[PDB]
């Protein structure tokens, strides 16, 4: 039935006079797929939506929200497109030169070089990494700290009742905000940014976002056993739990 739904979109996109209904329905369809984490499904739909839809449509409470929801959804997708690239890279680290104990004088020199070339690649694989870390992070904070009212949260409050959508928007927050936090923690930990890891407890507990309400009690503790792990590595470095110099 996947196709039935992703195909009803091209029918609504065809007629430009129904772009407001095409987007709204595109949202709904992408709300079902997100709850299943079908990101190639959600995105295959996301491209069918002409890149210039938003511009033309220009506002009923149903169109202000659907424009916001669409960008929220793009902010979410882009937060998985850049992580899978980053993650793919983290798993392609240059491998150490192989050792040939009891080497011939030939094998000694081939190895002096293979050992010197590797000490060039590992520097760039931290180079490319840093730039894929700086980018995946930004996206994770665009979703977690979504501007003007939080992610998947309507700004317009005068639409007509849509319990399906509304409760789909509360759920999407409870499936994906705990899951984006845990990823960002995994990104920060993987790159050794431990001080910042611990600063996820400010972001989450914050009264500005009230992200902690989107967490189950279990997920919290889990995030608290994740942070205590970053803390350790900060002690091993000689700093206090939170990364500040011990005077």
């Amino acid at each position: 039935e996947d196709r039935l739904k992703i195909d009803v979109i091209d029918w609504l996109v065809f007629d430009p006079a129904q772009r407001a209904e095409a987007l709204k329905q595109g949202n709904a369809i992408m709300r079902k797929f997100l709850a299943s984490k079908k990101h190639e499904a959600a995105k295959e739909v996301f491209v069918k939506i002409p890149q210039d839809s938003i511009a033309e449509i220009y506002l009923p409470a149903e169109d202000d929200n659907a424009i916001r929801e669409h960008l929220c959804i793009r902010a979410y997708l882009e937060a998985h497109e850049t992580f899978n690239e980053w993650f793919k890279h983290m798993n392609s680290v240059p491998q150490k030169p192989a050792l040939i104990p009891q080497p011939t004088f030939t094998e000694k020199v081939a190895h002096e070089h293979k050992e010197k070339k590797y000490e060039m690649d590992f520097g760039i694989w931290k180079g490319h990494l840093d730039a894929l870390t700086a980018d995946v992070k930004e996206k994770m904070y665009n979703v977690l700290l979504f501007v003007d009212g939080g992610w998947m949260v309507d700004v317009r409050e005068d639409a007509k009742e849509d319990h399906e959508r509304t409760h789909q928007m509360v759920l999407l927050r409870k499936l994906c905000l705990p899951m984006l936090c845990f990823l960002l923690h995994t990104i920060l930990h993987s790159t050794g940014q431990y001080q910042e890891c611990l600063q996820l407890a400010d972001m989450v507990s914050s009264e500005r976002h009230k992200l902690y309400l989107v967490f189950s009690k279990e997920e919290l503790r889990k995030l608290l056993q994740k942070l205590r792990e970053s803390s350790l590595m900060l002690l091993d470095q000689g700093l206090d739990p939170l990364g500040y110099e011990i005077q």
Partner: protein, 528 residues
């Protein structure tokens, strides 16, 4: 004078046959004596010590045995006739009898050992102090190398260093450097058991530790151990004599008694490091000999997997636990000792781990409060405390209290948080690396002439931080309403009176003017 010490030396001669007559020359002594404690009694000390020096100056062994008996019926013929006072030990020269005893058992311990290598190191040690009479009589002598044998130890060491310069180390030359180690050792074993029957000396011992360290670098296994059980036998007699001198001195003039502690403590550290390469099977006995020197036996238990030894150490100890935790912090199974060391401010950590969330919340808030050095950190701790408490198992009532008393903290903080980004580059302030500011600093900084775009909200919040005080309240209440007008350039005063919803503000006190009273009229209608 010499006539006196030659009169008691004459009464001890009769003190071997009968006493009556000698007890009347000790009775003539007490009446005819001076009896001024501070030096005349150390004038008959200088006599009893001048006759102990002459019973030591006295068949060379059976003749030196006859002299440890003579100086034994001389210490019994002093206890009786008494002889219950005097002591001029001072510096370098009662402890002086024992000492001259101990060195007469040393003289018989190296008389019992007589071989061609020590007799050669002795003849080199006596020809260096002076010449010898060559009318035969060549031990080359002892009766004076006894009253001073301490010297034939620092010289039969300089004759193991010139016999080691030719040693060419090579195996038979590391067997001659141990034969001497074994004699200076059991000559120090003989002075210890003569006290049980109750800076050159020491240098020559720290000199043969280091030469017993250079040799085990090249030595058949078993040999390198016997000279190690030896340099452990010897180091345990030095540390025992610095312990006995400590216990001898106490109280006043303590400064000198806590400076000699640091000196023996920098050596049980220099004897420990030395034994850090060596066998640790001896560490247990070196740690017990100077029965604390824990820093060494505590790092031997750390280098190995004997979390069983550091549990056996703390099992038999007086406050080692408070020592092994402060000795872990100063410096796997180390995380089980981290589990116990996380006791104290690192609390919250082992508390999240133990699933003791409520507990983690209490200490996380406590550390948030004391926090003054770093703002960014005071902010992090509350956030953690809060996420701890939320994740914990409080009843919906208690939880609502923790998050309300909390909401307060976040409310004050938020103030320093919203500090404009114009004055924080003006004042050249670190973004996060700044301190937890107080209400005053804040109120005064929110109003500085540096804060240029200061608008209604900057003052409103600089009047919200007055209940955050604990000096003059209404002096500031004015200070701020006044710069609230300087910025007006006679709009903002207007608004802040619109934001408050009043006999707070002053008046006549203020002017201390055409629209100040003019707005203070539709401010008596507003309040009413």
């Amino acid at each position: 004078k010499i006539k006196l010490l030659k009169a008691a030396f004459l009464q001890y001669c009769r003190k071997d046959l009968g006493h009556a007559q000698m007890v009347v020359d000790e009775l003539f002594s007490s009446h005819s004596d001076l009896d001024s404690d501070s030096e005349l009694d150390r004038a008959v000390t200088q006599i009893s010590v001048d006759l102990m020096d002459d019973y030591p100056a006295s068949i060379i062994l059976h003749q030196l045995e006859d002299k440890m008996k003579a100086h034994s019926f001389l210490m019994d013929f002093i206890h009786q006739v008494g002889l219950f006072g005097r002591l001029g030990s001072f510096p370098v020269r009662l402890l002086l009898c024992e000492h001259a005893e101990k060195l007469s058992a040393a003289i018989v311990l190296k008389n019992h050992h007589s071989r061609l290598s020590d007799l050669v190191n002795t003849a080199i040690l006596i020809a260096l102090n002076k010449r010898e009479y060559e009318i035969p009589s060549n031990l080359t002598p002892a009766d004076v190398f006894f009253r001073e044998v301490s010297q034939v130890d620092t010289i039969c060491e300089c004759l193991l260093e010139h016999e080691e310069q030719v040693l060419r180390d090579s195996i038979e030359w590391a067997e001659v450097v141990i034969n001497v180690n074994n004699i200076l050792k059991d000559m120090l074993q003989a002075a210890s058991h003569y006290r049980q029957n109750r800076r050159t000396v020491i240098i020559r011992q720290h000199e043969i530790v280091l030469k017993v360290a250079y040799p085990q670098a090249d030595s058949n296994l078993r040999n390198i151990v016997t000279e190690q059980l030896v340099a452990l036998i010897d180091c345990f007699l030095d540390g025992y004599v610095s312990q006995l001198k400590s216990v001898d001195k106490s109280s006043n003039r303590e400064r000198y008694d806590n400076l000699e502690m640091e000196y023996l403590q920098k050596r049980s550290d220099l004897l420990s490091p030395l034994l850090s390469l060596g066998q640790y099977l001896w560490a247990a006995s070196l740690a017990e000999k100077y029965c604390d020197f824990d820093i060494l036996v505590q790092m031997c238990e750390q280098t190995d997997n004997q979390s069983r030894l550091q549990r056996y150490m703390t099992q038999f100890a007086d406050q080692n636990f408070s020592d092994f935790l402060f000795r872990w912090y100063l410096e796997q199974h180390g995380q089980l000792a981290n589990f116990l060391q996380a006791h104290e401010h690192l609390s919250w950590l082992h508390e999240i781990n133990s699933q003791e969330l409520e507990k983690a919340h209490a200490t996380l808030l406590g550390l948030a409060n004391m926090e003054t050095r770093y703002f960014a950190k005071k902010k992090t701790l509350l956030g953690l405390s809060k996420l701890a408490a939320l994740a914990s198992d409080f009843s919906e009532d208690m939880l609502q209290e923790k998050i309300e008393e909390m909401a307060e903290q976040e409310r004050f903080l938020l103030h320093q948080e919203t500090l404009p980004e114009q004055l924080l580059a003006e004042k050249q302030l670190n973004l996060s690396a700044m301190p937890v500011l107080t209400a005053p600093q804040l109120i005064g900084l929110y109003i500085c002439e540096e804060n240029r775009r200061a608008n209604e909200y900057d003052f409103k919040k600089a009047l919200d931080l007055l209940e955050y005080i604990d000096i003059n309240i209404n002096d500031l209440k004015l200070e701020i309403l006044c710069k609230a007008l300087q910025r007006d350039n006679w709009v903002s005063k207007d608004s802040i009176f619109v934001k408050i919803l009043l006999p707070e503000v002053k008046d006549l006190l203020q002017a201390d003017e055409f629209v100040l009273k003019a707005n203070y009229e539709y401010y008596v209608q507003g309040q009413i």
